[PDB]
Amino acid sequence: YDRGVNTFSPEGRLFQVEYAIEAIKLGSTAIGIQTSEGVCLAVEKRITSPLMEPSSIEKIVEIDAHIGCAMSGLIADAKTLIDKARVETQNHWFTYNETMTVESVTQAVSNLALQFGEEDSRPFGVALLFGGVDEKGPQLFHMDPSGTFVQCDARAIGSASEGAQSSLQEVYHKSMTLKEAIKSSLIILKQVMEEKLNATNIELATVQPGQNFHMFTKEELEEVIKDI
Amino acid sequence: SSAGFDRHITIFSPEGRLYQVEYAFKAINQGGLTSVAVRGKDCAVIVTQKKVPDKLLDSSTVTHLFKITENIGCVMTGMTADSRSQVQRARYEAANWKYKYGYEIPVDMLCKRIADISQVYTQNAEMRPLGCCMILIGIDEEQGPQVYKCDPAGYYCGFKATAAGVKQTESTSFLEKKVKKKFDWTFEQTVETAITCLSTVLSIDFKPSEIEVGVVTVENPKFRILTEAEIDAHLVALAE
Amino acid sequence: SYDRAITVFSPDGHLFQVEYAQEAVKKGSTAVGVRGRDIVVLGVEKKSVAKLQDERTVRKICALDDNVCMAFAGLTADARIVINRARVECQSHRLTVEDPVTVEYITRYIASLKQRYTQSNGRRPFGISALIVGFDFDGTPRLYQTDPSGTYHAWKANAIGRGAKSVREFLEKNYTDEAIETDDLTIKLVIKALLEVVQSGGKNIELAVMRRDQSLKILNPEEIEKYVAEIEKEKEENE
Amino acid sequence: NQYDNDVTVWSPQGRIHQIEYAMEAVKQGSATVGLKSKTHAVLVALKRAQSELAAHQKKILHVDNHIGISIAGLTADARLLCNFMRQECLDSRFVFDRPLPVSRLVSLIGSKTQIPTQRYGRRPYGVGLLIAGYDDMGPHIFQTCPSANYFDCRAMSIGARSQSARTYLERHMSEFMECNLNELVKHGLRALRETLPAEQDLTTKNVSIGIVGKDLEFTIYDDDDVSPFLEGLEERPQ
Amino acid sequence: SRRYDSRTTIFSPEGRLYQVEYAMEAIGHAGTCLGILANDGVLLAAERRNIHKLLDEVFFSEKIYKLNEDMACSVAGITSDANVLTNELRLIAQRYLLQYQEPIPCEQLVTALCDIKQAYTQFGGKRPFGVSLLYIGWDKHYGFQLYQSDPSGNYGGWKATCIGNNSAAAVSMLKQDYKEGEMTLKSALALAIKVLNKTMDVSKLSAEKVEIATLTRENGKTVIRVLKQKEVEQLIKKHEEEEAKAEREK
Amino acid sequence: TGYDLSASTFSPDGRVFQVEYAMKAVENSSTAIGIRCKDGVVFGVEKLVLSKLYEEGSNKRLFNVDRHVGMAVAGLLADARSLADIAREEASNFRSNFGYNIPLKHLADRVAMYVHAYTLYSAVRPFGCSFMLGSYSVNDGAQLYMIDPSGVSYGYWGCAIGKARQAAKTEIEKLQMKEMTCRDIVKEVAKIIYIVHDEVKDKAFELELSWVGELTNGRHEIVPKDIREEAEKYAKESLK
Amino acid sequence: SIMSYNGGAVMAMKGKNCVAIAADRRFGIQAQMVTTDFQKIFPMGDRLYIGLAGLATDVQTVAQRLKFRLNLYELKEGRQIKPYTLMSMVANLLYEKRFGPYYTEPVIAGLDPKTFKPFICSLDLIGCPMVTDDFVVSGTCAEQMYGMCESLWEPNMDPDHLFETISQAMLNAVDRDAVSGMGVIVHIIEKDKITTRTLKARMD
Amino acid sequence: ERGYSFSLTTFSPSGKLVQIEYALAAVAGGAPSVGIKAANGVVLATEKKQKSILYDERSVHKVEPITKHIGLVYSGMGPDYRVLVHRARKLAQQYYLVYQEPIPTAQLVQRVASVMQEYTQSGGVRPFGVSLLICGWNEGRPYLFQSDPSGAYFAWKATAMGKNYVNGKTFLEKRYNEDLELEDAIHTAILTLKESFEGQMTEDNIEVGICNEAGFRRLTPTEVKDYLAAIA
């Protein structure tokens, strides 16, 4: 037998959901860190060819003007999640004249992932990191294909995420600053990837309370590399 | 041979056979029961035993004689649960004839419509083909009495002397030796052979309180279940 | 072991029936395409006429709208459904919104239509991969590509079909950072790229260019024979 | 082993194994303890961390002004029953203009979870709901199970290693009807500390306590207001 | 359930199709049909199956189905599956005439069927069509045409084509003897009777075992002539006469 | 056996094991008995305490279908709750369409046909419940019915459902139930429970007695034998 | 009315071995003409015609729906259609729109496909068939057409006098009508040939 | 229900359909039959023996009318026959409601075979186990067709379905000719049914229907006793 589409284990979880966690491991790594000054974020592009255009690979998208995002694993399933995440924050502004909070975004996102099967098919293969500045300051959250939703202070997901989280818990403390946390994250990046760290491998995403603009640094990132 | 899933569902095997319906032919045989119908005259007689194994078990709620309409009665063999659900269709569609068409349903027309419902369960899959059997009686004007019999396969026929349940092959062999000299069937010749067949196939020579007798006659066309007193009247009448 | 379903996962997290659809792409004829300064170009190989048929019904290069092209691989049946569906969307977009259709919008429709076509059981996915080339969005030349998983993606020079690994490795050492101006030079780059064909017969190349302002310009086997002559003229400097 | 595949398939011993396996998903979650007095019903849960610096996953969640529930098991079946739970609570407010009796709301859950334990196409709900409430006849402590049985009780503990919590409740259930909230709450969280490995202690960051009262609306205290409850405690006899 | 289902939709590990390759081989173990262009016509030829001497043949056409007004088609494969496609294809060509009041121009009729024949290889667990069939016709835009349907849905515009595993040596013969440019009707009929002499292994080419239908654009009418068995006879004896010239060289 | 997966398949000898498997799941449940006197029906259920935290009256097996109809279920308790809501809903439509109380002979037919429908398709399984139906009227007297998981439904004078189905009806049938009053029955039901294994190899138990008849004026409710406690006072004297 | 929105007149008449049919040519809105070449007689197979009159929408609509069903009939069966069979086909098409009806009244004229036997019939706007032996008329100016045909018709007529009778019946009746005219076309068919003639009428 | 919707028939690797070839085996093991097209009529005959001396003969018929000029017989299994008979009754009236004219026998077989096609392709159902013989005298010439459970059809002069059909196929070829009368055609239709019958042939062992131009007519046992009265 050994546990097809929808059938319990003799001990624990559904293995279709358990194998959905393993599909994230073949993704690309990404780091998000919450600081009281703002939320910084990073990812590795994994560009294969020079003819392959670099700026077509997106990992950070803009859900709203105060909410960023990050993805890993399957790109094909992630475009479905980002679509309604942009829609139902827009439906909230239509009926309440206000911005949806960062936590209650993923409430609506985690409703749709727990709907696989034939009821009115397969589970998803993509983890997400959500940065944003709501009325309670800056926030950082994370979800999985199992719908298990939780708040994190600093989280790394993707390939080699296990070795990332070991060194990341040493360099973190409660009194960080945003200019400190950005260079603190990319030191972890070049110690877990293998290519030489340049302006084409990685990209950043910062959101601030007073600077709700500019969720995407572009070639000001060249200054940060030469400083370290 | 067992090819594909011929032993499990209703598909064709090699040599044109199909096993899930001819397994239902001996789904009747777990009842431990035998029913006999005899047509000889301007009357028609059902006879069928009851089997009461418990003194806590009642007597009136055992009867297999079922009154479909006022002129049509039937007896059910096989398993009990499929039998009573088959009668719920027979009571229903006998009334749809009266509503749509405005007169009483013939006994020949009703046995067609029951067997056509058992057709689709053989035709369609994932639908269990109702392992029970039904025998009808009734009076048709300008045609006399009739006895019909339906199969789980959807096959029906009409014939004069009927056996069902477990012991067809011993009782139908007795009735061909009985019905070869077509003597005067005189409404007590019919009842006596209805008893003496079952009293020799089972070989019991039984007490007056283990059988039922359904009857219909062209002097009173209503379906009629006999009383324990008058069942005893016919039973001591053959004590010669 | 376990594949035989598009909804089940492997014990190491794979979708083998989705991955098997990309194996059907490698049975197709190769088609390349580059973008340039003004003139975009795409060419196909392996015509192989069979002496007794008309060749205007075996066409692999079609136009969705007036300023966007299409080249594909895979099997011919599934391409006809995607082409005929995409002509409707690039025309119904113009009705609902009075702009012309950008080259980026039509590739998201093809990828998303192939996306939901992979999720539900009893729906065999498309075993084709496509190249969408159009200098339509306000004078800017672009080219994208698709994938049977449903991932639209942008390159600057592309190769597909049976033998794409050699051509894509060839163009990385050949596509100069010097932009190929004097667009017959850019066309000669494709003919040099398509010179590494599976047999390289010379007369089995169907190059189609677009000067970003006119319609499609299908090249004849006399102008393309002139470009094959000058490729041998530059080859005389080896001695 | 061929009978161990679907909910529809009976066994030659007469036991459907898929219902028997959904009980095992309840034991994966952490322990939680609920109990009641004559006037006050308090359920206490135990948080579990995911990492060393993520927030702890919440267990007790508000439902209505007189109903609050705990959780143990799958988080997918948790919020799916909660949205069915909240919809039924406000329909009686909209139609009857009264709060629901607690005993008849749980009968709607057993009718809800019965269909996916008989018809093919949906697994049973792996869930361990504990329910506290107030109808017109005082407090109640209810539990459910993925076999769609619901048990009225005066004290109950379910989850990981919750057998040691049950032994504490049986030898102190005579004291529960009279004592008030200053010790009734810390009668309950003395039962959680046997469901722990013997080296760490129940801190302020890993426990939730929810109180609904006769004159008190259901209130969830966590991580700041647990300190007036954890004061005045002894240690484990080590 | 699950254990009762057929596959019909699942790729190979190498990428090929499991059921589509099987249906393309049952057509080769069936009858023989072919066509040939002319400068002023087009024709079809067919092989008779079940030539037993207790049949009627009262339909005047068995392989040929005159479909719109100026088009017909041969057929090959499962004959029980073939009647569904013909009643649909006449119905596709007739709703076009309700829509534009112009006859269907002989290509997008074929693509309308080839989208229907394709769709059973895709979504829905169903059996694909095991029928390949020919096409003849005339339009305003290109003229006389042949097409080649497939169970996969592929079509091709041929000048002279036939059926495979039954008569695959004919395609090798048609590349040798069909000369380009001049292919007129009397030259094309004598070419067709030469081919069926070899492929059908019955000697002397009994006229009850063949069937020939033609199409000529004649004075703005586009007649479809299913020529009778009386003039099949002298068409055979013309080819039978060609043996007498064929022995003069030796 | 392998040929026993679906409920829509037959064995090679002609029976469905999925119905056979669900019958002996009722066998593992505790004993619930039923009995009727000349002017009423008296129920009685042996029910065991799970550990200690049971709160004295939870999850009962004496339901209340109509004004005069209740159940005495045994088996899977959750499956009986969904089946009890069908009988509550069925008796409501008979009131709204005909204007009077449901007869028990017609009520048991509507329920048993509903149990029958889950024994035919491969999508659903048969029920794992068996139960009792008791009622009282002035035009019909007292009746007592019995429904198996297969759907066979007919009448008794006394019955038992559980482990001791045979071991209880041995000493039910030595009672003169045809002439006793249903106040004398209540002290006689309690000794039938306490003879056969109340807490011998089990831990604990609690007796429940439901009650309907002439003294209740057709109402169905639990006994007032919390008042005067006479059932346990009279049955525990039978130790020797 | 709705029938008087565009006008029209269709007449059929039975002869000895032949049958004739005629109609007008004027197309127009209530008082304003548009053109004088509006077809109202449509061939449905050889030696069998049909004429339509009424609302100009339903004239062009039903003549395409009937052509849709005729070609599907003549391909499932190798034979042609009998004149009795077409009358049952048209009456089915009009009755399906029982409460949304087409505003036309068809006139069917033709010969037998096997013998030489003529056939004429007319239908209502909901499909009541009505066969006669002398003539059928339909259109707005119906009462003027009964006055001419009841006095001029003879039982057994050659194609010479049959043409001259239906000519004088159409010219004298339509010139009395206001919303019909501008030319009359006449079809006269027989076993051997089909003759179509147009008449010299008043163009006012 | 669930809505399973999957067919039980796919291709072999050789390219044959397996379940349709199995259904023809149940056809060949049925009751034998014979049909002969004469110069002025069509003769149908069949083999109707009861398993007992108890079974009435006036209850179930084999020769069955469809319209007043169309009849229809079979060789296969019993209860599947009555489905497509009632299907062909409602189908033949729909032609009459549209065209006000009785259906020709060629057009009826165009649609009955499409019904038998539909149970071969659709989901979860099994194909028929009944082949037919369809007769009728429409537009002067009479007709005689045969439809199989695969969905195809043919047009015979004389044929035989049921058991021992390969013996009756050679016997009809050695006995039939270009033309006979209908009264001569029944004589060679019992003599081919006497080939495979039992030791006794009475008025109730066989059952014969005819097709004159006057319409369809099945024969009472008075004629069939008088027809087999020493005329072979």
PDB file of N, CA, C and O in Angstrom, chain D residues 3 7-8 10-13 36 114 117-118 120 147-155 170, chain F residues 4 18 21 24-25 51-55 58-59 77-79 81 118 123-127:
ATOM      1  N   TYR D   3      -7.052  -4.576   4.179  1.00  0.00           N
ATOM      2  CA  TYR D   3      -8.212  -3.908   4.747  1.00  0.00           C
ATOM      3  C   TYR D   3      -7.874  -2.533   5.296  1.00  0.00           C
ATOM      4  O   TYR D   3      -8.786  -1.770   5.629  1.00  0.00           O
ATOM      5  N   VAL D   7     -11.859   4.127   4.481  1.00  0.00           N
ATOM      6  CA  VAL D   7     -12.804   4.247   5.581  1.00  0.00           C
ATOM      7  C   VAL D   7     -13.976   3.295   5.372  1.00  0.00           C
ATOM      8  O   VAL D   7     -14.551   2.780   6.338  1.00  0.00           O
ATOM      9  N   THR D   8     -14.311   3.012   4.112  1.00  0.00           N
ATOM     10  CA  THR D   8     -15.473   2.192   3.794  1.00  0.00           C
ATOM     11  C   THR D   8     -15.245   0.723   4.142  1.00  0.00           C
ATOM     12  O   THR D   8     -16.177   0.031   4.566  1.00  0.00           O
ATOM     13  N   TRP D  10     -14.653  -2.566   5.882  1.00  0.00           N
ATOM     14  CA  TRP D  10     -14.678  -3.198   7.191  1.00  0.00           C
ATOM     15  C   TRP D  10     -13.569  -4.239   7.301  1.00  0.00           C
ATOM     16  O   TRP D  10     -12.961  -4.647   6.311  1.00  0.00           O
ATOM     17  N   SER D  11     -13.323  -4.672   8.515  1.00  0.00           N
ATOM     18  CA  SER D  11     -12.324  -5.694   8.761  1.00  0.00           C
ATOM     19  C   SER D  11     -12.985  -7.017   9.100  1.00  0.00           C
ATOM     20  O   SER D  11     -14.140  -7.056   9.529  1.00  0.00           O
ATOM     21  N   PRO D  12     -12.274  -8.137   8.928  1.00  0.00           N
ATOM     22  CA  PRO D  12     -12.779  -9.416   9.447  1.00  0.00           C
ATOM     23  C   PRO D  12     -12.788  -9.514  10.963  1.00  0.00           C
ATOM     24  O   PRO D  12     -13.319 -10.494  11.494  1.00  0.00           O
ATOM     25  N   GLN D  13     -12.212  -8.552  11.681  1.00  0.00           N
ATOM     26  CA  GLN D  13     -12.404  -8.433  13.116  1.00  0.00           C
ATOM     27  C   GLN D  13     -13.468  -7.409  13.480  1.00  0.00           C
ATOM     28  O   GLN D  13     -13.839  -7.315  14.653  1.00  0.00           O
ATOM     29  N   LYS D  36     -13.671  22.029  35.841  1.00  0.00           N
ATOM     30  CA  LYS D  36     -14.690  22.990  36.232  1.00  0.00           C
ATOM     31  C   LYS D  36     -15.073  22.818  37.694  1.00  0.00           C
ATOM     32  O   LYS D  36     -14.926  21.738  38.274  1.00  0.00           O
ATOM     33  N   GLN D 114     -19.578  12.971  11.087  1.00  0.00           N
ATOM     34  CA  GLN D 114     -20.016  11.599  10.805  1.00  0.00           C
ATOM     35  C   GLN D 114     -19.969  11.271   9.311  1.00  0.00           C
ATOM     36  O   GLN D 114     -19.511  10.198   8.929  1.00  0.00           O
ATOM     37  N   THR D 117     -16.616  10.273   8.078  1.00  0.00           N
ATOM     38  CA  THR D 117     -16.213   8.935   8.531  1.00  0.00           C
ATOM     39  C   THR D 117     -17.047   7.811   7.932  1.00  0.00           C
ATOM     40  O   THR D 117     -16.956   6.675   8.401  1.00  0.00           O
ATOM     41  N   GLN D 118     -17.904   8.091   6.958  1.00  0.00           N
ATOM     42  CA  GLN D 118     -18.591   6.984   6.298  1.00  0.00           C
ATOM     43  C   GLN D 118     -18.475   7.026   4.781  1.00  0.00           C
ATOM     44  O   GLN D 118     -18.250   5.990   4.158  1.00  0.00           O
ATOM     45  N   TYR D 120     -16.833   7.779   1.079  1.00  0.00           N
ATOM     46  CA  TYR D 120     -15.497   7.816   0.498  1.00  0.00           C
ATOM     47  C   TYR D 120     -15.252   9.169  -0.151  1.00  0.00           C
ATOM     48  O   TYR D 120     -16.162   9.772  -0.726  1.00  0.00           O
ATOM     49  N   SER D 147     -13.463   9.712  16.177  1.00  0.00           N
ATOM     50  CA  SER D 147     -14.513   8.723  15.995  1.00  0.00           C
ATOM     51  C   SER D 147     -15.906   9.304  16.205  1.00  0.00           C
ATOM     52  O   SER D 147     -16.856   8.535  16.377  1.00  0.00           O
ATOM     53  N   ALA D 148     -16.021  10.639  16.243  1.00  0.00           N
ATOM     54  CA  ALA D 148     -17.281  11.393  16.298  1.00  0.00           C
ATOM     55  C   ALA D 148     -18.090  11.115  17.565  1.00  0.00           C
ATOM     56  O   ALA D 148     -19.304  11.324  17.594  1.00  0.00           O
ATOM     57  N   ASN D 149     -17.434  10.660  18.626  1.00  0.00           N
ATOM     58  CA  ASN D 149     -18.065  10.532  19.931  1.00  0.00           C
ATOM     59  C   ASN D 149     -17.709  11.743  20.777  1.00  0.00           C
ATOM     60  O   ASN D 149     -16.569  12.213  20.757  1.00  0.00           O
ATOM     61  N   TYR D 150     -18.685  12.254  21.515  1.00  0.00           N
ATOM     62  CA  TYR D 150     -18.453  13.383  22.400  1.00  0.00           C
ATOM     63  C   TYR D 150     -18.828  13.001  23.821  1.00  0.00           C
ATOM     64  O   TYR D 150     -19.870  12.383  24.059  1.00  0.00           O
ATOM     65  N   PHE D 151     -17.953  13.347  24.761  1.00  0.00           N
ATOM     66  CA  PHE D 151     -18.036  12.872  26.136  1.00  0.00           C
ATOM     67  C   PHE D 151     -18.192  14.074  27.054  1.00  0.00           C
ATOM     68  O   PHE D 151     -17.332  14.961  27.067  1.00  0.00           O
ATOM     69  N   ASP D 152     -19.282  14.109  27.816  1.00  0.00           N
ATOM     70  CA  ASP D 152     -19.388  15.057  28.915  1.00  0.00           C
ATOM     71  C   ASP D 152     -18.519  14.564  30.061  1.00  0.00           C
ATOM     72  O   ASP D 152     -18.465  13.363  30.341  1.00  0.00           O
ATOM     73  N   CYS D 153     -17.843  15.494  30.726  1.00  0.00           N
ATOM     74  CA  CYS D 153     -16.924  15.151  31.797  1.00  0.00           C
ATOM     75  C   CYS D 153     -16.759  16.350  32.715  1.00  0.00           C
ATOM     76  O   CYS D 153     -17.150  17.472  32.385  1.00  0.00           O
ATOM     77  N   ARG D 154     -16.171  16.097  33.880  1.00  0.00           N
ATOM     78  CA  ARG D 154     -15.845  17.149  34.828  1.00  0.00           C
ATOM     79  C   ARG D 154     -14.368  17.509  34.832  1.00  0.00           C
ATOM     80  O   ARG D 154     -14.009  18.577  35.340  1.00  0.00           O
ATOM     81  N   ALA D 155     -13.512  16.655  34.277  1.00  0.00           N
ATOM     82  CA  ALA D 155     -12.095  16.933  34.107  1.00  0.00           C
ATOM     83  C   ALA D 155     -11.584  16.016  33.010  1.00  0.00           C
ATOM     84  O   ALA D 155     -12.044  14.877  32.898  1.00  0.00           O
ATOM     85  N   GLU D 170      -7.803  12.376  38.998  1.00  0.00           N
ATOM     86  CA  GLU D 170      -8.710  11.423  39.628  1.00  0.00           C
ATOM     87  C   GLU D 170      -8.612  11.465  41.146  1.00  0.00           C
ATOM     88  O   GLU D 170      -9.610  11.244  41.838  1.00  0.00           O
TER      89      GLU D 170
ATOM     90  N   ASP F   4     -14.172  -9.795  -0.527  1.00  0.00           N
ATOM     91  CA  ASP F   4     -14.926  -9.211   0.577  1.00  0.00           C
ATOM     92  C   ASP F   4     -14.626  -7.729   0.791  1.00  0.00           C
ATOM     93  O   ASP F   4     -14.808  -7.226   1.903  1.00  0.00           O
ATOM     94  N   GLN F  18     -19.150  -7.897   3.835  1.00  0.00           N
ATOM     95  CA  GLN F  18     -19.131  -6.565   4.430  1.00  0.00           C
ATOM     96  C   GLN F  18     -20.344  -6.332   5.317  1.00  0.00           C
ATOM     97  O   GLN F  18     -20.259  -5.592   6.301  1.00  0.00           O
ATOM     98  N   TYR F  21     -19.324  -8.607   8.328  1.00  0.00           N
ATOM     99  CA  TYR F  21     -18.309  -8.032   9.202  1.00  0.00           C
ATOM    100  C   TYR F  21     -18.903  -6.989  10.136  1.00  0.00           C
ATOM    101  O   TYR F  21     -18.484  -6.885  11.294  1.00  0.00           O
ATOM    102  N   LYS F  24     -20.899  -8.392  13.589  1.00  0.00           N
ATOM    103  CA  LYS F  24     -20.174  -8.770  14.791  1.00  0.00           C
ATOM    104  C   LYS F  24     -19.340  -7.631  15.359  1.00  0.00           C
ATOM    105  O   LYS F  24     -18.587  -7.845  16.313  1.00  0.00           O
ATOM    106  N   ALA F  25     -19.460  -6.430  14.800  1.00  0.00           N
ATOM    107  CA  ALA F  25     -19.029  -5.230  15.499  1.00  0.00           C
ATOM    108  C   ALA F  25     -20.049  -4.784  16.532  1.00  0.00           C
ATOM    109  O   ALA F  25     -19.679  -4.139  17.518  1.00  0.00           O
ATOM    110  N   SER F  51     -13.604   5.561  32.579  1.00  0.00           N
ATOM    111  CA  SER F  51     -12.644   5.398  33.664  1.00  0.00           C
ATOM    112  C   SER F  51     -13.142   5.895  35.016  1.00  0.00           C
ATOM    113  O   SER F  51     -13.495   5.090  35.882  1.00  0.00           O
ATOM    114  N   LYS F  52     -13.192   7.215  35.206  1.00  0.00           N
ATOM    115  CA  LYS F  52     -13.816   7.783  36.395  1.00  0.00           C
ATOM    116  C   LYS F  52     -14.407   9.152  36.081  1.00  0.00           C
ATOM    117  O   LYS F  52     -15.316   9.629  36.769  1.00  0.00           O
ATOM    118  N   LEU F  53     -13.923   9.769  35.006  1.00  0.00           N
ATOM    119  CA  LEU F  53     -14.194  11.175  34.740  1.00  0.00           C
ATOM    120  C   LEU F  53     -15.501  11.391  33.996  1.00  0.00           C
ATOM    121  O   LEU F  53     -15.846  12.541  33.704  1.00  0.00           O
ATOM    122  N   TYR F  54     -16.197  10.305  33.655  1.00  0.00           N
ATOM    123  CA  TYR F  54     -17.584  10.327  33.211  1.00  0.00           C
ATOM    124  C   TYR F  54     -18.452  11.083  34.210  1.00  0.00           C
ATOM    125  O   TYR F  54     -18.256  10.979  35.422  1.00  0.00           O
ATOM    126  N   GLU F  55     -19.417  11.852  33.705  1.00  0.00           N
ATOM    127  CA  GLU F  55     -20.120  12.755  34.609  1.00  0.00           C
ATOM    128  C   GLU F  55     -21.585  12.345  34.755  1.00  0.00           C
ATOM    129  O   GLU F  55     -22.487  13.190  34.710  1.00  0.00           O
ATOM    130  N   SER F  58     -23.749  11.119  30.859  1.00  0.00           N
ATOM    131  CA  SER F  58     -23.291  11.459  29.526  1.00  0.00           C
ATOM    132  C   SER F  58     -23.542  10.298  28.572  1.00  0.00           C
ATOM    133  O   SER F  58     -23.881   9.187  28.989  1.00  0.00           O
ATOM    134  N   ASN F  59     -23.416  10.611  27.272  1.00  0.00           N
ATOM    135  CA  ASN F  59     -23.448   9.764  26.071  1.00  0.00           C
ATOM    136  C   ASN F  59     -24.376   8.550  26.153  1.00  0.00           C
ATOM    137  O   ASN F  59     -23.972   7.416  25.876  1.00  0.00           O
ATOM    138  N   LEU F  77     -21.430   4.180  18.798  1.00  0.00           N
ATOM    139  CA  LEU F  77     -22.335   5.178  19.355  1.00  0.00           C
ATOM    140  C   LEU F  77     -22.506   6.373  18.429  1.00  0.00           C
ATOM    141  O   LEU F  77     -23.615   6.909  18.316  1.00  0.00           O
ATOM    142  N   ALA F  78     -21.436   6.787  17.747  1.00  0.00           N
ATOM    143  CA  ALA F  78     -21.523   7.922  16.836  1.00  0.00           C
ATOM    144  C   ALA F  78     -22.367   7.602  15.613  1.00  0.00           C
ATOM    145  O   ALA F  78     -23.077   8.476  15.105  1.00  0.00           O
ATOM    146  N   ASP F  79     -22.311   6.360  15.138  1.00  0.00           N
ATOM    147  CA  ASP F  79     -23.132   5.944  14.012  1.00  0.00           C
ATOM    148  C   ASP F  79     -24.605   5.852  14.396  1.00  0.00           C
ATOM    149  O   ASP F  79     -25.473   6.041  13.538  1.00  0.00           O
ATOM    150  N   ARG F  81     -26.031   7.959  16.552  1.00  0.00           N
ATOM    151  CA  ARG F  81     -26.520   9.327  16.692  1.00  0.00           C
ATOM    152  C   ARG F  81     -27.010   9.875  15.360  1.00  0.00           C
ATOM    153  O   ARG F  81     -28.039  10.558  15.303  1.00  0.00           O
ATOM    154  N   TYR F 118     -27.450   1.657   2.455  1.00  0.00           N
ATOM    155  CA  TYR F 118     -26.014   1.697   2.686  1.00  0.00           C
ATOM    156  C   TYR F 118     -25.361   0.329   2.569  1.00  0.00           C
ATOM    157  O   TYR F 118     -24.183   0.187   2.909  1.00  0.00           O
ATOM    158  N   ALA F 123     -19.492   3.082  -2.589  1.00  0.00           N
ATOM    159  CA  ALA F 123     -19.021   4.347  -2.039  1.00  0.00           C
ATOM    160  C   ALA F 123     -19.198   4.403  -0.529  1.00  0.00           C
ATOM    161  O   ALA F 123     -18.372   4.992   0.176  1.00  0.00           O
ATOM    162  N   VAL F 124     -20.262   3.795  -0.017  1.00  0.00           N
ATOM    163  CA  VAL F 124     -20.588   3.850   1.396  1.00  0.00           C
ATOM    164  C   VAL F 124     -20.474   2.449   1.986  1.00  0.00           C
ATOM    165  O   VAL F 124     -20.426   1.450   1.271  1.00  0.00           O
ATOM    166  N   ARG F 125     -20.424   2.387   3.309  1.00  0.00           N
ATOM    167  CA  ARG F 125     -20.375   1.127   4.026  1.00  0.00           C
ATOM    168  C   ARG F 125     -21.686   0.889   4.767  1.00  0.00           C
ATOM    169  O   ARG F 125     -22.461   1.824   4.990  1.00  0.00           O
ATOM    170  N   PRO F 126     -21.985  -0.358   5.137  1.00  0.00           N
ATOM    171  CA  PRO F 126     -23.129  -0.597   6.021  1.00  0.00           C
ATOM    172  C   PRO F 126     -22.897  -0.022   7.408  1.00  0.00           C
ATOM    173  O   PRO F 126     -21.762   0.199   7.834  1.00  0.00           O
ATOM    174  N   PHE F 127     -24.002   0.230   8.104  1.00  0.00           N
ATOM    175  CA  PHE F 127     -23.955   0.730   9.468  1.00  0.00           C
ATOM    176  C   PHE F 127     -23.398  -0.323  10.418  1.00  0.00           C
ATOM    177  O   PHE F 127     -23.371  -1.520  10.121  1.00  0.00           O
TER     178      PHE F 127
END
